[PDB]
Amino acid sequence: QKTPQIQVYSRHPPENGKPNILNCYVTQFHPPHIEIQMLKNGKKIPKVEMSDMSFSKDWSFYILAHTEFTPTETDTYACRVKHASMAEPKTVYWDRDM
Amino acid sequence: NYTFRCLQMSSFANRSWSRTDSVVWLGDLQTHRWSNDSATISFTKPWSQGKLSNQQWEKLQHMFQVYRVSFTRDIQELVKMMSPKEDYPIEIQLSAGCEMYPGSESFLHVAFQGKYVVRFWGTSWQTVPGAPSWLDLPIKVLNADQGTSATVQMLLNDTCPLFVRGLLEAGKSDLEKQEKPVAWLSSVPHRQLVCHVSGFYPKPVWVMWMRGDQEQQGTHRGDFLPNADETWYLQATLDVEAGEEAGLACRVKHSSLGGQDIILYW
Ligand SMILES: *[C@@H]1O[C@H](CO[C@@H]2O[C@@H](C)[C@@H](O)[C@@H](O)[C@@H]2O)[C@@H](O[C@@H]2O[C@H](CO)[C@@H](O[C@@H]3O[C@H](CO[C@H]4O[C@H](CO)[C@@H](O)[C@H](O)[C@@H]4O)[C@@H](O)[C@H](O[C@H]4O[C@H](CO)[C@@H](O)[C@H](O)[C@@H]4O)[C@@H]3O)[C@H](O)[C@H]2NC(C)=O)[C@H](O)[C@H]1NC(C)=O
Ligand SMILES: CCCCCCCC(=O)N[C@@H](CO[C@H]1O[C@H](CO)[C@H](O)[C@H](O)[C@H]1O)[C@H](O)[C@H](O)CCCC(=O)Nc1ccc(CCCCC)cc1
Ligand SMILES: CCCCCCCCCCCCCCCC(=O)O
Ligand SMILES: *[C@@H]1O[C@H](CO)[C@@H](O)[C@H](O)[C@H]1NC(C)=O
Ligand SMILES: *[C@@H]1O[C@H](CO)[C@@H](O)[C@H](O)[C@H]1NC(C)=O
């Protein structure tokens, strides 16, 4: 019924070679059942931590995923979401600045 | 003005599968979690019991344990009675609590399939205008349960504001914490300059693109995004002409900075 919006951003200024935290914030979806992965070079990152699912004033659900990451200029990062509102999984790549 | 929100999310997939999970917020800080898997309500702060004794807490918890089972049973029975006209899957959400004002008001709102349908108000449950008419009879029936109505009235009118006043005392150092933003600038290689501000708490913040002392009213503030460590993230963008980036700066004011603003020159 409602399609998830995905935002990907880092906790600290992204500096190459320095450990950091990458966030994937998924919002504005219904129903609440959802599958969220974070990817490094297209491959699933294993240790991804998730907040409890909650919902907003408008009743749409939201959830925050995060993982440790070390940005370099040889690695891509992304957040991939599977949800009944979408025919295919939706992937949003970290834009390298956020 | 702190708002205490207990958020219940119940998913009923079919007659054999359902779960109910809750989270509790005091303002933007999570104080409790109650997983379907857990018999007891979990604390997400050392002060989540407020000023309630262990015995007072177990009684309140017990009331919610009975509610969770009864609610689940009631919805399952209702769906069986309505079959096949109303059928699975079903999402029900409850938002209940109280907003604390200086010198309170309480609320209990219920949504079905993502739409607000029912509230408790005054001394009774009521369907809201536009809600499906099939809800009217089940709500009338629920309203005949005086004991439930009296318990809900107590919880909203009395228990909520009292519990929350205890939380505000017990959690004061966390609620009044100050965390400093860190900022950084970027753009793609006419341009859009982005000022990223991360790690600030509490939420109120001012972020502006400046040329000297002049605020650039073209500054577009993004949405507030949560970090996983109970701090906030915000970006402010400015669309500029190419070659016109020199002399611009991002300025951040925040309560945690003690009047020493962050100023980042492009
Ligand atoms: C808990 O607080 C309730 C009020 O607070 C609101 O609801 C709670 C759940 C929170 O969300 C809170 O934030 C909200 O602000 C309180 O509800 C009130 O209960 C009293 C009676 O107990 C009701 O009084 C009766 O009112 C009706 C008229 O109601 C209509 O008109 C008024 C305005 O004039 C509107 O405000 C209403 O919405 C309605 O449109 C009278 O007809 C009735 O008179 C008859 O009964 C009395 C005895 O009660 C006799 O003396 C008379 O002779 C009459 O026969 C009452 O006066 C009040 O409507 C209701 N408020 C609301 C907004 O519905 C609840 O009682 C509290 N419970 C506890 C345990 O603390
Ligand atoms: C945040 C909600 C808090 C509700 C607290 C309810 C208290 C309770 O547990 N009531 C159940 C127990 O009822 C018996 O025991 C009481 C003593 O503990 C009293 O003596 C009472 O008289 C006695 O009957 C009772 O079973 C309730 O029916 C529990 C479910 C109440 C409820 O919330 N029902 C509900 C709400 C909304 C809706 C509509 C939305 C869903 C639309 C599909 C339908 C049903
Ligand atoms: C529901 C109104 C609550 C008002 C009284 C405050 C009681 C403290 C509640 C502690 C957290 C309970 C969280 C689970 C509640 C739920 O099932 O949604
Ligand atoms: C009921 O729903 C659950 C959760 O989606 C599913 O795993 C299960 O197969 C369903 N059971 C039946 C009997 O349809
Ligand atoms: C949720 O908890 C109830 C009560 O223990 C249990 O019966 C039910 O099977 C649980 N649901 C799921 C999907 O685990």
Q: What is the CB-side half-sphere exposure of residue B75 using CA atoms within 13 A?
A: 25
Residue at token pair 């008419």: B133
Rounded Cα distance, B93 and B166, in Å:
26
Same domain, B26 and B138: yes
- Residue B247 one-letter amino acid: G
CA–centroid distance, B16 to ligand 2, in Å, is: 21
Residue nearest to atom 8 of ligand 4 (CA): B17
Residues B83 and B156 in one domain: yes
Domain boundary among the residues B129, B154, B176 is at B176
Helix ranges (H only) for B113-253 are 136-143, 146-154, 160-170, 172-175
Q: Choose among B159, B162, B160, B175: nearest CA to B46.
A: B175
Q: What are chain A's domains? A: 1-98 (2.60.40.10)
Closest of B159, B170, B175, B162 to residue B50, by C-alpha:
B170
Determine if ligand 1 sits within 6 Å of the CB of residue B148: no
Closest CA to B5 of B77, B85, B109: B109
User: In angstroms, rounded to a whole number, what is the distance separating the alpha carbons of residues B154 and B38?
Assistant: 26
**Of the candidates A37, A61, A41, A60, the residue with the CA atom closest to the CA atom of residue A50:** A37
Residue A50, both tokens: 């998730």
- Judge if B22 and B142 occupy the same domain: yes
The token pair that represents B140 in the structure block: 């009338």
d(CA B61, CA A33): 27
Examine the fold and report which residue of B116, B144, B176 is the final residue of a domain before the chain moves on.
Answer: B176
Experimental method: X-ray
B42-49, Cβ contacts within 8 angstroms, sequence gap of 24 or more = B45/B171, B45/B174, B47/B167, B47/B170, B47/B171, B47/B174, B48/B167, B49/B170
| Alpha carbon distance B255, B30 (integer Å) | 22
B4, β-bridge pairs: B26, B98
Q: Calculate the alpha carbon distances from B68 to B39, B50, B123, B185, B243 in Å.
A: 10, 22, 21, 49, 62
Cα A35 from Cα A63, distance rounded (Å)? 11
User: Is B265 near chain A, with CB under 8 Å?
Assistant: no
